[PDB]
Symmetry: D3
Subunit: 161 residues, 6 copies
């Protein structure tokens, strides 16, 4: 059971849920809220290590782009990024990050199987971008990148985030 | 709450939800309806552009997209589409799906295909309330072998979830919705953003 | 409606939902249970075939998959499985899961691992009502570094959704 | 012994060796002649076949090759071919080269291109005694960035080695030679083996 | 100076150079002898190790090599080895070659195979004076399609270059030479450095 | 004709050819001198640019190259550079080489490294008459495993070939030569074309 657009907006009014900045009415529709891309990226530098045992001589310094700059996501490359919006969920809501079909049709994955936003989460969401396509994708802060949907839990989470 | 098999049948009978052609009972079980592969495909031509500027000027984006997308591939009967490792291709479900304003659908792949590397979507798997049409698939082969895909094969599964109420802005009424009544392997319309 | 953590423990206590071995409460938070990695693996050997025809049942499974798979790789502890970028490997969860006819399950990854490119499924992530057993994992490394994986590590997260009613053709019947 | 720049000029003056159009003095130095990129290309269409059986039955091989090779791509002036990382493409030199029976030629790339990942051949770089024609290039981009290739750019270098004597079976006289008088981006003729 | 066809035959007749089995006149032309593919192969098993420390402690390097190399694959008659894009595999020439102290040899691929992406070596293509044995090939498919390789196919070419004099330390006399009298698809012996 | 080990030693004694530091006798055999890996490296930063326009406007090319090339990496003693499959990196030989106007040099890899997928060049492997300096290596790992590279390891081999006479336009006298007296892991200077 997902919250329809009208109940998403009612939870935003009520302060049960908060998304800041708040997307316009045009970006809240069906069972989803459209979310945009922020301005902090990282990439991986493999020459420093042979492997990781499942930490961070391998990550770049945070990359913040100048106005009018794009991050170029090349095919076969994983990059970390953030949502522009901060999201705060109550103890009885779980959220689910999904991509956009327009971007999937060019090969952009906006996550890599972890896509659950936990009850009690508060913060911008970290994105793991992967370009499975043939062409480099120029990514710019502020672009629509995904969508979030919200599922109420059976009851309130005892151990929320 | 997802609809169990029995309730999917009841929504289909009531005409709330439609899937055309309607799958037989054998294809509806648990909490999912199996869907089949259509016969329209599209590939990418990288040599004609350096990149795609996703949120660039509409006319530039549009011209880049038209350069990189192949024409639609239609397979005869007996023909396979060979999906090579590392290649992304667009395909389409045989079935058209129509959802009412108070239901959302979700596309998943099949474990039998996944174990060979076949991804049937690339993180966009939601079918919106008010959707009507064939579903475009973005296949990616993450395995070690080419996979021969044939029209009519079972390619994924759809599940359905009731919304908390009817959507106020369902897909069929949204003025800026890009993919209303989509029929073949439709390329990205990111230029309409 | 996902089951929340307290409601996950209830269902386990009832005994229709079961995970064997039973995870400690430390592993059950919010609306998910963390699951662990088993010690059975499979890789592919490309050199014995040109392709696989996915239009099928069972003729592939066998005459295909069986012929392009490794024998089963069982690791002694102290040993790692090295998952190299761009390689797909088959693994299995440590725990066996049994679902009743009125519940569907869903395997997700862990954000901590996904940030390094670990994909724990490849679009098929639904555990059906009536399902009984260890879950097969299809791992894929989308990152830039090999990842060492060790039997027993926390590898993913399961969440659970009640069905609208009990399924009529559940996995054990079908 | 390779011919030094002075001797390459003497062989060209004597008409022993020909390169058409003849490069200017600025392109002939040390032990090499710099060559330029032509404007014909070819790519591969993988989705039409599972594999190529190199020493299989001639008619099956031939049909597979005709399926997988694109039509010839001809670039206008102003146009680039975009060579993406991991992609193999065929191209052709601007120059036609004719060798006598007592000389062998060798194609190399340029360090400036190599340091970006551009390979101009794939382990076949010998130009046989008796050869006459344009040279087909198999480009592979082993780097991290797409490379815009434009007709007319400097793409590699040829050097030349006298043989111990004139070849008895030079290329122009061999009945089973596959590539005599080649002109565009000619695809593999492995089916003629 | 490379030996022309006629002089290759003269060196073979004189027993200065040997190639066993001796290729027929049809395979010796211009400045080269065509060589054929043997029936022994080796692949790599990545899952057993994180990396190879090339100049590490000998025992650690040796243990890593033994873990990553497959057992020798021997093809029956009729059987193909399928070389998929992006895969490196070891193979061997059908012919054994023996060089005297005053000759060096050079392995090239074939343009017909190169045009499909097949590299027959990975920047090591010298056959040393005093060499005796079958030649190990490191195949890499840089193309878009799997290639079916069959024993006995023509895979490459050898040319031969006189040295300025006889080598004082030819391969057959060097104590630390690793690959003397190699016969199957011998894996790297970098651990002997 | 390549110089045999004995003549390489004579050319070095005569000061015709220089290699600094001079390799010991154990590293000079057959027709080659073994060379060793230096301790400077450079990688690529793809996220800063969409592509490189090889024969575009000089200032655009120059700005793109400055964006995509890393700063020089210098490894301490004990440190390895990890070269992952599919990655291209720039490195340098430990040795500086100086060639006279009548000699050309040729860089090859090692069979031991090739059997693990290490390419030490990307089709540009000529050292010109009049060259003086350390040689930049473009490493590519075509194998399945990361390779740990350490400064000082044996990485390849140089051979030498007399020219038909002294070059009139050797590298040290060419005004437009791009890489005279190169010392570290120098990036492509394709912008100087
Ligand atoms: O794999 C998919 C996923 C979705 N759809 C359809 C159903 C869905 O209702 C519609 C829009 O999906 P989404 O909102 O992801 O796409 P968008 O790129 O945001 O398009 P829009 O601008 O119309 O929302 O596309 C497909 O054809 N294939
Ligand atoms: O794409 C994602 C996915 C998740 N998260 C956040 C929201 C979620 O509530 C939290 C934890 O996710 P998960 O439980 O998957 O991470 P973990 O690896 O288990 O770490 P933890 O120990 O924090 O539970 O990470 C993101 O920011 N981006
Ligand atoms: O990553 C997964 C996903 C699913 N399953 C199990 C649970 C699920 O209930 C069953 C069947 O899944 P699915 O319907 O995706 O498989 P299929 O390929 O359609 O096979 P079947 O014909 O058995 O339904 O497989 C796994 O072991 N691993
Ligand atoms: O792997 C190599 C190959 C060459 N060189 C040096 C020696 C050679 O003499 C010089 C120039 O080589 P080339 O002519 O192939 O490079 P270019 O791009 O043509 O530059 P230029 O215009 O200076 O000739 O660079 C290297 O350092 N590394
Ligand atoms: O990069 C190259 C290499 C060679 N050739 C031409 C010149 C050479 O003289 C001829 C044949 O080369 P090769 O003998 O390597 O080709 P093959 O596949 O063996 O063909 P054939 O049966 O004609 O010898 O092809 C090219 O056009 N491009
Ligand atoms: O593709 C090849 C190239 C060479 N060789 C043989 C012939 C050559 O004379 C010998 C040694 O080659 P190289 O010197 O390149 O190998 P190494 O790694 O340096 O070994 P060594 O320490 O024996 O010199 O290996 C092959 O079998 N296959
Ligand atoms: Mg949308
Ligand atoms: Mg199923
Ligand atoms: Mg967690
Ligand atoms: Mg040059
Ligand atoms: Mg030939
Ligand atoms: Mg050696």
């Amino acid at each position: 059971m997902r919250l329809c657009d009208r109940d998403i907006e009612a939870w935003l009014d009520e302060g049960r849920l908060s998304i800041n900045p708040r997307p316009p009415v045009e970006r809240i529709n069906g069972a989803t809220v459209d979310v945009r891309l922020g301005n902090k990226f990282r990439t991986f530098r493999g020459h420093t290590a042979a492997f990781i045992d499942l930490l961070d001589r391998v990550m770049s310094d945070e990359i913040v782009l100048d106005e009018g700059e794009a991050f170029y996501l090349h095919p076969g490359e994983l990059a970390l990024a953030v949502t522009l919006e901060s999201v705060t969920l109550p103890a009885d809501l779980v959220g689910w990050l999904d991509g956009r079909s327009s971007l999937a049709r060019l090969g952009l994955m906006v996550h890599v199987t972890a896509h659950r936003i936990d009850p009690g989460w508060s913060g911008c969401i970290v994105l793991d971008f992967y370009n499975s396509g043939k062409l480099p994708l120029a990514l710019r802060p502020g672009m629509l990148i995904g969508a979030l949907s919200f599922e109420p839990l059976s009851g309130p989470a005892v151990r929320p985030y």
